Scaffold this active site. Sequence first.
Site, mmCIF file in Angstrom:
data_model
loop_
_atom_site.group_PDB
_atom_site.id
_atom_site.type_symbol
_atom_site.label_atom_id
_atom_site.label_comp_id
_atom_site.label_asym_id
_atom_site.label_seq_id
_atom_site.Cartn_x
_atom_site.Cartn_y
_atom_site.Cartn_z
ATOM 1 N N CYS B 108 0.797 -1.232 0.000
ATOM 2 C CA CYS B 108 0.000 0.000 0.000
ATOM 3 C C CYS B 108 0.823 1.272 0.000
ATOM 4 C CB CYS B 108 -1.046 0.023 1.145
ATOM 5 S SG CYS B 108 -2.084 1.541 1.131
ATOM 6 N N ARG B 111 -0.121 4.587 2.692
ATOM 7 C CA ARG B 111 -0.057 4.397 4.158
ATOM 8 C C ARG B 111 0.275 5.633 5.007
ATOM 9 N NH1 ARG B 111 3.742 -0.574 4.831
ATOM 10 N NH2 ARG B 111 4.342 -0.086 2.635
ATOM 11 N N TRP B 280 -9.313 6.331 -1.111
ATOM 12 C CA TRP B 280 -9.614 7.032 -2.362
ATOM 13 C C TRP B 280 -8.615 6.601 -3.440
ATOM 14 C CZ3 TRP B 280 -8.543 9.829 2.167
ATOM 15 C CH2 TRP B 280 -7.220 10.325 2.296
HETATM 16 C C1 HEM Z 1 -6.470 6.395 1.478
HETATM 17 C C2 HEM Z 1 -5.990 6.329 0.227
HETATM 18 C C3 HEM Z 1 -5.309 5.065 -0.322
HETATM 19 C C4 HEM Z 1 -4.596 5.023 -1.462
HETATM 20 C C5 HEM Z 1 -4.288 6.168 -2.476
HETATM 21 C C6 HEM Z 1 -4.142 3.662 -1.598
HETATM 22 C C7 HEM Z 1 -3.400 3.171 -2.635
HETATM 23 C C8 HEM Z 1 -3.242 1.831 -2.881
HETATM 24 C C9 HEM Z 1 -2.819 1.243 -4.132
HETATM 25 C C10 HEM Z 1 -2.505 2.057 -5.410
HETATM 26 C C11 HEM Z 1 -2.700 -0.070 -3.936
HETATM 27 C C12 HEM Z 1 -2.299 -1.156 -4.956
HETATM 28 C C13 HEM Z 1 -3.632 -1.776 -5.389
HETATM 29 C C14 HEM Z 1 -3.704 -2.111 -6.853
HETATM 30 O O1 HEM Z 1 -2.829 -1.637 -7.640
HETATM 31 O O2 HEM Z 1 -4.667 -2.866 -7.216
HETATM 32 C C15 HEM Z 1 -3.096 -0.360 -2.583
HETATM 33 C C16 HEM Z 1 -3.080 -1.617 -2.010
HETATM 34 C C17 HEM Z 1 -3.513 -1.946 -0.753
HETATM 35 N N1 HEM Z 1 -3.967 -1.075 0.222
HETATM 36 FE FE1 HEM Z 1 -4.139 0.943 -0.086
HETATM 37 N N2 HEM Z 1 -4.540 2.927 -0.493
HETATM 38 C C18 HEM Z 1 -5.331 3.726 0.290
HETATM 39 C C19 HEM Z 1 -5.988 3.344 1.462
HETATM 40 C C20 HEM Z 1 -6.014 2.087 2.050
HETATM 41 C C21 HEM Z 1 -6.793 1.681 3.192
HETATM 42 C C22 HEM Z 1 -7.804 2.581 3.942
HETATM 43 C C23 HEM Z 1 -6.471 0.416 3.473
HETATM 44 C C24 HEM Z 1 -7.005 -0.491 4.600
HETATM 45 C C25 HEM Z 1 -7.462 0.057 5.743
HETATM 46 C C26 HEM Z 1 -5.524 -0.022 2.506
HETATM 47 C C27 HEM Z 1 -4.909 -1.255 2.460
HETATM 48 C C28 HEM Z 1 -4.358 -1.785 1.336
HETATM 49 C C29 HEM Z 1 -4.043 -3.183 1.169
HETATM 50 C C30 HEM Z 1 -4.256 -4.333 2.195
HETATM 51 C C31 HEM Z 1 -3.474 -3.290 -0.220
HETATM 52 C C32 HEM Z 1 -2.973 -4.578 -0.930
HETATM 53 C C33 HEM Z 1 -4.243 -5.124 -1.572
HETATM 54 C C34 HEM Z 1 -4.064 -6.449 -2.263
HETATM 55 O O3 HEM Z 1 -3.036 -7.156 -2.107
HETATM 56 O O4 HEM Z 1 -5.018 -6.791 -3.001
HETATM 57 N N3 HEM Z 1 -5.219 1.027 1.682
HETATM 58 N N4 HEM Z 1 -3.325 0.830 -1.930
HETATM 59 C C1 LIG Z 2 -5.223 -12.435 -7.010
HETATM 60 C C2 LIG Z 2 -5.192 -11.207 -6.132
HETATM 61 C C3 LIG Z 2 -4.418 -11.186 -4.967
HETATM 62 C C4 LIG Z 2 -4.393 -10.040 -4.163
HETATM 63 N N1 LIG Z 2 -3.650 -9.993 -3.025
HETATM 64 N N2 LIG Z 2 -5.129 -8.964 -4.526
HETATM 65 C C5 LIG Z 2 -5.889 -8.962 -5.655
HETATM 66 C C6 LIG Z 2 -6.701 -7.736 -6.004
HETATM 67 C C7 LIG Z 2 -5.770 -6.546 -6.186
HETATM 68 C C8 LIG Z 2 -6.616 -5.313 -6.431
HETATM 69 C C9 LIG Z 2 -7.229 -5.200 -7.677
HETATM 70 N N3 LIG Z 2 -7.970 -4.133 -7.950
HETATM 71 C C10 LIG Z 2 -8.143 -3.160 -7.036
HETATM 72 C C11 LIG Z 2 -7.546 -3.202 -5.771
HETATM 73 C C12 LIG Z 2 -7.819 -2.048 -4.812
HETATM 74 C C13 LIG Z 2 -6.579 -1.340 -4.271
HETATM 75 C C14 LIG Z 2 -6.946 -0.094 -3.457
HETATM 76 C C15 LIG Z 2 -7.497 -0.224 -2.181
HETATM 77 C C16 LIG Z 2 -7.848 0.896 -1.426
HETATM 78 C C17 LIG Z 2 -8.446 0.690 -0.056
HETATM 79 C C18 LIG Z 2 -7.615 2.175 -1.939
HETATM 80 C C19 LIG Z 2 -7.043 2.267 -3.233
HETATM 81 N N4 LIG Z 2 -6.792 3.462 -3.793
HETATM 82 N N5 LIG Z 2 -6.744 1.163 -3.953
HETATM 83 C C20 LIG Z 2 -6.779 -4.322 -5.444
HETATM 84 C C21 LIG Z 2 -5.937 -10.084 -6.481
#
Ligand code: HEM
Ligand SMILES: Cc1cc(N)nc(CCc2cncc(CCc3cc(C)cc(N)n3)c2)c1
Lengths: 407, 411
Positions: B108, B111, B280
């Site tokens: 993320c 963070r 967002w």
């Molecule tokens: C507040 C603005 C936030 C922004 C701009 C942001 C941005 C991102 C981005 C760009 C990713 C990669 C996801 C992707 O490319 O599909 C991500 C992943 C992730 N974020 Fe954030 N995030 C935000 C808030 C949060 C919040 C509120 C949480 C949880 C409380 C969170 C937890 C995670 C987790 C667990 C992942 C990995 C997801 C996965 O493996 O599928 N994030 N974040």
């Molecule tokens: C196979 C698999 C594994 C894994 N760990 N995650 C995924 C989904 C990854 C994924 C795909 N599209 C969208 C997101 C959301 C990421 C995201 C989450 C939040 C909370 C804010 C933000 N700006 N962006 C995450 C797939």
Amino acid sequence: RFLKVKNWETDVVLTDTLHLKSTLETGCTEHICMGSIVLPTKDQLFPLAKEFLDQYYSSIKRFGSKAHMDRLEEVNKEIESTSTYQLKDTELIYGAKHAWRNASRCVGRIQWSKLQVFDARDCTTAHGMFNYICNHVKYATNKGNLRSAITIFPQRTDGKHDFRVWNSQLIRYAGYKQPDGSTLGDPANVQFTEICIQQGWKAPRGRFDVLPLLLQANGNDPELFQIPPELVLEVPIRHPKFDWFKDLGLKWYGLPAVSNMLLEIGGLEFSACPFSGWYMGTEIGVRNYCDNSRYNILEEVAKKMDLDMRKTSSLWKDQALVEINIAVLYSFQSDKVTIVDHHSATESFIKHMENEYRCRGGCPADWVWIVPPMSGSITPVFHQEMLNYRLTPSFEYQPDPWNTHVW
Amino acid sequence: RFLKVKNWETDVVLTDTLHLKSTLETGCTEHICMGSIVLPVRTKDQLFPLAKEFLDQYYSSIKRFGSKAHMDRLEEVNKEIESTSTYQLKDTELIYGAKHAWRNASRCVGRIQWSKLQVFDARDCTTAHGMFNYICNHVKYATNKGNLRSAITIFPQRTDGKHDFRVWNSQLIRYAGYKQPDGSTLGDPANVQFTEICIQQGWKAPRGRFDVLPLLLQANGNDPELFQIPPELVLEVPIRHPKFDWFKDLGLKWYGLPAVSNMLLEIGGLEFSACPFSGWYMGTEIGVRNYCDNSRYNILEEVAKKMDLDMRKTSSLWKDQALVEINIAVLYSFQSDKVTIVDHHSATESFIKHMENEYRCRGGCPADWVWIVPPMSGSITPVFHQEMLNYRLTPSFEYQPDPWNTHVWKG
Ligand code: HEM
Ligand SMILES: Cc1cc(N)nc(CCc2cncc(CCc3cc(C)cc(N)n3)c2)c1
Ligand code: HEM
Ligand SMILES: Cc1cc(N)nc(CCc2cncc(CCc3cc(C)cc(N)n3)c2)c1
Ligand SMILES: C[C@H](O)[C@H](O)[C@H]1CNc2nc(N)[nH]c(=O)c2N1
Ligand SMILES: C[C@H](O)[C@H](O)[C@H]1CNc2nc(N)[nH]c(=O)c2N1
Ligand SMILES: [Cl-]
Ligand SMILES: [Cl-]
Ligand SMILES: [Cl-]
Ligand SMILES: [Cl-]
Ligand SMILES: [Zn+2]
Ligand SMILES: [Zn+2]
Ligand SMILES: [Zn+2]
């Protein structure tokens, strides 16, 4: 133990078995991944030799043959007797081609088997080295139709008679600290440039001065040589639509030739083994021109383009980046100097990777280096899972010789 | 032991000691790095150690380590585990836990925002209808008419693994995908399988390009039920371009609220299998991934065609040129409509500041470079040249398999 890699765009899954032949350490443990870290006697030599000869004899389908056993005994006797051994020409060529094959950070490996190997193990002086290098440069450059090549100098003996090319690449531009506080030329080469000056180089103090070679033979103190200017093919950079682009005064050299790495084959160590291919455009347009610690031209270009630089969210940096990269490719193509764009290079690598999985059981790859430094996800490598591991023969990092050398 | 990371643009070197608190495994070994692999019912025995480790961390964070309240809480949790086989978190521990799972999320980039999470405690929830209500409230709160606020809603924890709460949607808000008989896809190809489930469950699909999916909600291990999110709660942004007037006629829009609903939150050994969370968008999630992936909306060709780029050779970089324009359009549209969004330059610059702060105050910041580096313009962002160490800290968010693979249907 058998491992799957998935492509997330195509759903294709491949099975890696080759990693079981991996040897060196990755730097990762079960507790911590170091995937993004750039740098993570007679007794040991014989197993290394055996491992290599076994793979060699297997490759020419004569594994376990009398010629296999006889060669193993021969090398063994030579090590017991001399504490080292000499590779046969055929083993040298095989080893060099496989060190490239095994280079997990190189996107261009589809080419691995076409490498021209120049055996320079008869070289004894820095002047001999200079001759061999000019010949490499001319062969590889080939008036712009570039050909991959490696030139291999004598192997390490006691480690106090090392051959080294002190330059990082055969061709690179000088860097100079200005009274201004700014940097003129390439900031990556400041330290090397000062060493050249202190060894006696007369510096032109320009923005694009081709560095001289600083060559070390037989552990002797290194010597300076200027590559004949007519052997250094350079490209002036222009844009197909922006006429003002040429006034930035930008150029780059056609031949990327890494000269600071160590080739390990069959436990033997070749500390001077300059090798060359041709450029992927992003290397010049993204890294060399746009890194903050490199020529750092983004601001100037965006300004000429009349972009709104008040806010990052106008994506002015991204627009200027694309245009710089368009110009690099256009300029190389117009001058008929081999270059590959990142779409073409990565497509080729995916094709290579599937070949290697099919015919070899895997292909070590370092995603962090393989994914281009721009437009990552719109290239096919981004969605490709890769497994990174170390196979020999290999190219290895080695420390800069000016830390190691005693004068 | 001390581990060093270097930034290759600035030469700044940081030292990590936090990795010493790492527990879970990476998938990597001394012989193989799995850094680019996407995916690389507890006993009482294993549970109290996880509980104690968590509570020691909680009580240290509040400057009460070894206090009577600390010891009393350890004792209370121990006894609760021995007689019930599980335990309940206090509200304060829940909030702390959820905040930390975000802080610890190595993939993320957002963070810097971790301490501002709004936590909705839905542990009193018992039915799918109850879940629907909680989720609408979360959506409305987080959306805040465009001024987006980060939030998480936490449903009851796992007990025997036969009574799980699950949100079957991957995200709270996502568009349907429909596979046509001619092999083409209408709408979002990422959601074809889940769309098919929704339909099988009785959803009447409008079958358009941007149909907001219904929620499919499972309470207490029961069969999931369909609910439609009130359309007035779903904030959406029509995509236009500041200079290209034809961009609007592509008919593109996206939703404003990214809300991950398929992950598992682990706190102190307890498993929260339904814990939807939202923040967002960073613009490239929509402009690069959602629009331009070949297995997503795949619009690069249509855009470049309209821009009259030379498409006969990849080396004109037509794809890169169209990519930038689309991403310009997304940021422009969101900003014009006053819906929170962050560009990849701003987000990555903030992350590096966050990261250096974490090294100073916490001894480290686990980060997955493969995910942190944005999917366009990688090396002109300050994260590209930043070495990172990836390791697993708890509390954490974890992948869990899609529930249609595991659910025992009641009928
Ligand atoms: C507040 C603005 C936030 C922004 C701009 C942001 C941005 C991102 C981005 C760009 C990713 C990669 C996801 C992707 O490319 O599909 C991500 C992943 C992730 N974020 Fe954030 N995030 C935000 C808030 C949060 C919040 C509120 C949480 C949880 C409380 C969170 C937890 C995670 C987790 C667990 C992942 C990995 C997801 C996965 O493996 O599928 N994030 N974040
Ligand atoms: C196979 C698999 C594994 C894994 N760990 N995650 C995924 C989904 C990854 C994924 C795909 N599209 C969208 C997101 C959301 C990421 C995201 C989450 C939040 C909370 C804010 C933000 N700006 N962006 C995450 C797939
Ligand atoms: C022929 C065309 C070639 C292309 C397009 C190419 C492409 C690349 C690129 C883009 C990189 C990473 C660039 C960087 O980050 O600095 C790289 C790294 C590397 N390549 Fe190649 N390559 C080619 C030929 C070769 C040859 C001929 C060899 C050796 C015989 C080689 C061995 C290596 C090694 C060892 C690395 C990693 C070097 C390091 O760690 O600094 N490549 N290649
Ligand atoms: C600290 C450090 C470690 C390491 N392993 N490599 C380096 C050098 C990285 C590096 C920088 N510019 C250029 C290159 C060469 C890349 C390259 C090599 C060849 C042969 C062809 C081609 N197209 N491109 C390599 C530095
Ligand atoms: C194979 C590779 O690890 C995979 O495609 C990853 C790479 N990096 C990513 N980074 C982000 N933010 N999101 C992703 O989905 C991915 N996909
Ligand atoms: C810290 C990070 O690993 C480092 O900046 C790497 C990232 N990926 C790279 N990839 C390539 N091809 N070349 C590089 O020099 C780098 N630098
Ligand atoms: Cl770079
Ligand atoms: Cl770089
Ligand atoms: Cl993507
Ligand atoms: Cl993706
Ligand atoms: Zn690793
Ligand atoms: Zn760089
Ligand atoms: Zn993608």
